[PDB]
Write a protein that binds this ligand. Structure first.
Ligand SMILES: [Ca+2]
Ligand SMILES: [Ca+2]
Length: 75
């Protein structure tokens, strides 16, 4: 991976609804773990927790829309 072609926030809206499996508008550690396994990668409790605290801007433990966008587009 050199560069992902990030197509505005609209591509991130579609990405957000995959990564949120329950449809509440917050990505928890259970959801990010599940969707990583659906991508083919098996991530453990500790590794997903590292990615949740990495993506979550406010430190509540659940990654809503703005928190997911800022992390996705800058990374
Ligand atoms: Ca959710
Ligand atoms: Ca949060």
């Amino acid at each position: 991976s050199l560069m992902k072609d990030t197509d505005s926030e609209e591509e991130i809206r579609e990405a957000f609804r995959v990564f949120d499996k329950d449809g509440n508008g917050y990505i928890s550690a259970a959801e990010l773990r599940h969707v990583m396994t659906n991508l083919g990668e098996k991530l453990t409790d500790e590794e997903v927790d590292e990615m949740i605290r990495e993506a979550d801007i406010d430190g509540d433990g659940q990654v809503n829309y703005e928190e997911f966008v800022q992390h996705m587009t800058a990374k």
